[PDB]
Design a protein around this ligand. Structure first.
Ligand SMILES: COc1ccc2c(c1OC)C[N@+]1(C)CCc3cc4c(cc3[C@@H]1C2)OCO4
Ligand SMILES: COc1ccc2c(c1OC)C[N@+]1(C)CCc3cc4c(cc3[C@@H]1C2)OCO4
Ligand SMILES: Nc1ncnc2c1ncn2[C@@H]1O[C@H](CSCC[C@H](N)C(=O)O)[C@@H](O)[C@H]1O
Ligand SMILES: Nc1ncnc2c1ncn2[C@@H]1O[C@H](CSCC[C@H](N)C(=O)O)[C@@H](O)[C@H]1O
Lengths: 347, 347
């Protein structure tokens, strides 16, 4: 029945209404799994999860997703995502806000909450296509901004964009952050929807703290559930969705509070969440834009992929990610899965 | 109308059913005040509260309550409370568990969760009548156990009990903890329902950390609400209850998570809550026992108080505390106000 559903899915035989319904149900089951009848039990559940993280490696399973997803061609990414190719929840002020506007508003929100000021050294960990790196570099000309990514395609895209934008204050480190060794410290460290690719947050935060001084601030933004934590993994044997979107071990969804338990080496200063309708609007805009540019996307992908079938596979994956993300983040008007943000200083 | 209600109350003219109803309503209004429509707003509210604490003195307003309540005669306290005169939520396994049994079960739970082991030095901050100090001293003969209290009556009670119980490993420091200076460190620091009498938790935790080594553990138990924090203060102009029970500035009710934001100098290891029906059962047992020993209580109090009217005042205060506490802690079957517990080590 799994192979059946997957079969129809790949062959575009599941209508959008049915697809949305199916994925919503899967998320409903995660909610039933995660909510406990008493706060006593809720904390026992959450603490068990947190403790389990401390017995893992720093890194999640990243190898496959890096090769398959994070090393996709920039030109395909341009046809699906907004102008700066942001791959993270964006911020929509108005009904009529476009994805390009929502990217910029999100960048501004991060600069505000991370207390970016001109002249600082800034490290963006898991910088993606570098929308935030480029935003900070252009807005704060005396900042030096470093992006760090384990993707060659991302690094190359950023450096080309910086050259086109006449920015002189940008560099990019190509590194697996879990393996990166350096004595360098930064005034500001930003981690936008990258920590989900880590497991042992204790070890990750420890390493980040060694790249901070007493003057530094660390800003983290992560997909969350407000109440409980879960790995982004099949809820049961009927769950065709979760393991299609991300490989096992790749992505953790921390609760909105989970990082409060990872203060061995940094100390919290502030804590927010952004309602999930912003993320819902983000994935919806991506889905609609991919649909609009569907023919173009297929043409871009066909060389490097080799077959119309393999192209349709990548497209189905991205589109289904958006359709499913819509149900996840819009659930109960954005009050289940959402985005958490925290500001820390070093011990 | 306030003076009216207070008038009838002091004159025993409010029946129990009406009293319970009135106080429940007051707690209902606190719930409406504290629950926000979105987690975004809930965190904004909670963070504002936490930030406000960092701009206060370490100590709450303790002077009046110390003189009026914490310096009451032990013999009166014996007639209202359980065998060890525990003044904190206790733990009831069974329908038929007595307050004396519930005190002991609570003491055992603290020893378990604080990881007490024979041979450790132990400091009990705000030790009350020393039930926990005496429990640890008797169960772990190689432990040295120090109680600390700002009450002369409490110190004197504990030292007499230790002498009667043939304990040689107990001492008591008479000190305001917010003023206590010492180079002494302890393997274990316990704070059972005392932190509610502090305000600036940042300064309080900082001081406790200076009394810890790398080997120490800090265990805190505090009355909480699961979701939000509040001062125990009049909700509005109709609230005759809150300011009758505690003086303004005396008692803070932290959320179940609030202490997670006070990790500048200590780091969390574990976190629990105990459902509020345990506290409800605790105050109910006190209320019933005071009622049973009402005539005796009045006789004990009459000397030091000087008038039957002033005696009735103290009795009304304690009884109303129990009646109101019942409504507070039993609200929604113990799933609103409850007891939070956390275990920390030093940075
Ligand atoms: C498909 O292009 C993406 C677009 C946006 C995001 C990701 C994408 O994939 C590469 C992945 N991030 C980075 C990791 C964490 C994460 C987990 C999610 C999510 C978005 C995320 C975030 C945001 O929706 C459910 O679960
Ligand atoms: C009346 O004898 C008492 C009996 C139990 C307790 C206290 C008593 O007073 C001295 C006060 N503590 C210590 C401080 C914190 C606190 C706050 C409370 C409470 C109990 C508490 C605790 C637990 O019920 C609503 O709010
Ligand atoms: N171990 C690792 N080391 C370095 N970068 C990593 C990594 N695991 C994942 N990444 C990167 O983390 C990012 C996650 S996607 C988020 C990208 C960007 N912050 C944005 O908001 O658009 C991608 O750049 C991915 O390449
Ligand atoms: N500033 C301060 N310094 C020292 N003790 C204080 C204090 N403020 C309050 N206390 C003490 O804190 C205790 C609160 S009542 C709890 C008593 C005991 N832990 C029990 O569980 O029964 C009382 O002993 C009170 O005297």
């Amino acid at each position: 029945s799994i192979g059946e559903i997957m079969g129809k899915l790949m062959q575009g035989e599941i209508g959008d209404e049915e697809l949305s319904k199916r994925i919503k149900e899967i998320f409903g089951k995660r909610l039933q799994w995660g909510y406990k009848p008493t706060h006593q039990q809720q904390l026992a559940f959450n603490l068990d999860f947190i403790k389990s993280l401390k017995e893992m490696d720093m890194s999640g399973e990243i190898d496959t997703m890096n090769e398959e997803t994070y090393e996709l061609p920039s030109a395909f990414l341009e046809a699906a995502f907004g102008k700066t190719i942001k791959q993270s929840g964006c911020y929509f002020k108005d009904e009529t806000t476009t994805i390009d506007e929502a990217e910029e508003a999100s960048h501004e929100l991060y600069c505000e909450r991370a207390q970016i000021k001109d002249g600082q050294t800034v490290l963006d960990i898991g910088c993606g296509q570098g929308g935030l790196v480029l935003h900070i570099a252009q807005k704060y000309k005396n900042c030096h901004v470093t992006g760090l990514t384990n993707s060659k395609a991302q690094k190359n895209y950023i450096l080309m964009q910086a050259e086109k934008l006449q920015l002189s204050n940008v560099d990019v480190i190509l590194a697996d952050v879990t393996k990166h060794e350096s004595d360098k410290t930064y005034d500001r460290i930003l981690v936008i929807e990258t920590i989900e690719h880590m497991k042992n947050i204790q070890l990750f935060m420890k390493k980040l703290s060694t790249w901070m001084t007493e003057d530094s601030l660390l800003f983290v933004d992560h997909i969350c559930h407000k109440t409980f934590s879960h790995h982004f993994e099949a809820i049961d044997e009927d769950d065709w969705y979760s393991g299609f979107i991300f490989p096992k071990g790749c992505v953790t969804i921390l609760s909105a509070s989970a990082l409060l338990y990872f203060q061995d080496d940094v100390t919290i200063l502030d804590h927010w969440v952004v309602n999930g309708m912003h993320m819902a609007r983000s994935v919806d805009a991506w889905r609609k834009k991919l649909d609009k540019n569907m023919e173009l996307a297929r043409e871009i992908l066909l060389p490097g992929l080799g077959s119309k079938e393999a192209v349709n596979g990548v497209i189905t994956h991205i589109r289904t990610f958006c359709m499913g993300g819509y149900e996840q983040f819009s659930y109960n008007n954005g009050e289940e899965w959402m985005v958490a943000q925290m500001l820390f200083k070093k011990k």
